[PDB]
């Protein structure tokens, strides 16, 4: 019942997301977007969840974690159960899938979660293609002068485009009401792909905030008792 949204910043065209356990760039405006989108809710009485892999957790600066004003869940196969409170603001789960089921119980969650954001792991994103209802993808491009950063972790673009379509026309409507974005909706060709969304420039990069949504599904079967 609660929307599950993967959120990620990726450098085109390979959609690289990381290098040696860290981000390949440092972009304050992209950081600001991530913070505001994952924090803010339309309903003042709710929070969002942010679910992450152990390795992503370990890579967030210690002064900045857990991420304020959001329910943090860290997943590790060495943890004890599906969803366990370990400290203020911090849950542990030994299962991405079972933690989502647990978070979705109206009984457990009192309908006071607005959205569940999956905020990474490369490994976590790989497993999320079949779990996410949408993706918020910041598509990053080095400006002509700009050296492409080295990268070793990538979003599965093939799986993305199999399952989801570019719904960035609806990005503004989709984001929490009180967020304010600088750009206007723009469509630009870049190395032979259409890049559509809300543009920003910072340091060596231009980037677009985009929204991907699940493609329509045929009706093959509905479970009957
Ligand atoms: N650009 C962006 O928008 C973002 C980029 N990143 C980047 O991604 C990289 C980190 O990604 P990656 O190395 O893949 O690691 P992840 O952050 O995806 O963490 C992987 C770990 O999560 C645990 N795990 C994986 N699947 C499950 C599951 N189904 N249930 C329970 N636990 C599970 C395992 O922990 P364990 O080994 O303890 O069992 C595994 O080693 C970094 O470079 C980081 O900078 C991260 C977030 C955002
Ligand atoms: C700094 C926002 C980037 C970001 N951007 C987008 N579009 N999606 C995301 N999921 C993240 C993310 C993340 C997790 C993260 C947070 C962080 O400080 C808060 C430091 C390192 C991080 O991962 C290595
Ligand atoms: Mg535990
Ligand atoms: Mg699992």
TrEMBL record:
GO biological process: dihydrofolate metabolic process; folic acid metabolic process; one-carbon metabolic process; tetrahydrofolate biosynthetic process
Enzyme class: oxidoreductase
Keyword Oxidoreductase: yes
Residue numbers binding NADPH: 9, 17, 22, 54-56, 76-77, 96, 121-124, 127
EC number(s) recorded for this UniProt protein: 1.5.1.3
Metabolic or biological pathway: Cofactor biosynthesis; tetrahydrofolate biosynthesis; 5,6,7,8-tetrahydrofolate from 7,8-dihydrofolate: step 1/1
GO (cellular component) term, any one: mitochondrion
Keywords: NADP, Nucleotide-binding, One-carbon metabolism, Oxidoreductase
Domain DHFR: 3-214
GO molecular-function terms, A-Z: dihydrofolate reductase activity; mRNA binding; NADP binding
Residues passing through the membrane, by range: none
One family name in Pfam for this protein: DHFR_1
Record family assignment: Belongs to the dihydrofolate reductase family.
Name of the molecule in the record: Dihydrofolate reductase
Species: Candida glabrata (strain ATCC 2001 / BCRC 20586 / JCM 3761 / NBRC 0622 / NRRL Y-65 / CBS 138)
């Amino acid at each position: 019942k609660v929307p599950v949204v993967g959120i990620v910043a990726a450098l085109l065209p390979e959609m690289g997301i990381g290098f040696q356990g860290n981000l390949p760039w440092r972009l304050a405006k992209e950081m600001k977007y991530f913070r505001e989108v994952t924090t803010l809710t339309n309903d003042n009485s709710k929070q969002n969840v942010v679910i992450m892999g152990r390795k992503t957790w370990e890579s967030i600066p210690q002064k900045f974690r857990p991420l304020p004003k959001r329910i943090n869940v860290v997943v590790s196969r060495s943890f004890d159960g599906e969803l366990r409170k370990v400290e203020d603001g911090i849950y542990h789960s030994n299962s991405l899938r079972n933690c989502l089921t647990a978070l979705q119980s109206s009984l457990a969650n009192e309908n006071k979660i607005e959205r569940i954001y999956i905020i990474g792991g490369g490994e976590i994103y790989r497993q999320s293609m079949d779990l996410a209802d949408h993706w918020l993808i910041t598509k990053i491009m080095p400006l002509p002068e700009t050296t492409i950063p080295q990268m070793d972790t990538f979003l599965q673009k093939q799986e993305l485009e199999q399952r989801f379509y570019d719904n960035s026309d609806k990005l503004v409507d989709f984001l929490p009401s009180s967020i304010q974005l600088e750009g206007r909706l723009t469509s630009q060709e870049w190395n032979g792909e259409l890049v559509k969304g809300l543009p920003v420039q910072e340091k060596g990069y231009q980037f677009y905030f985009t929204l991907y949504t699940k493609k329509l599904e045929h009706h093959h079967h509905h479970h009957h008792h």
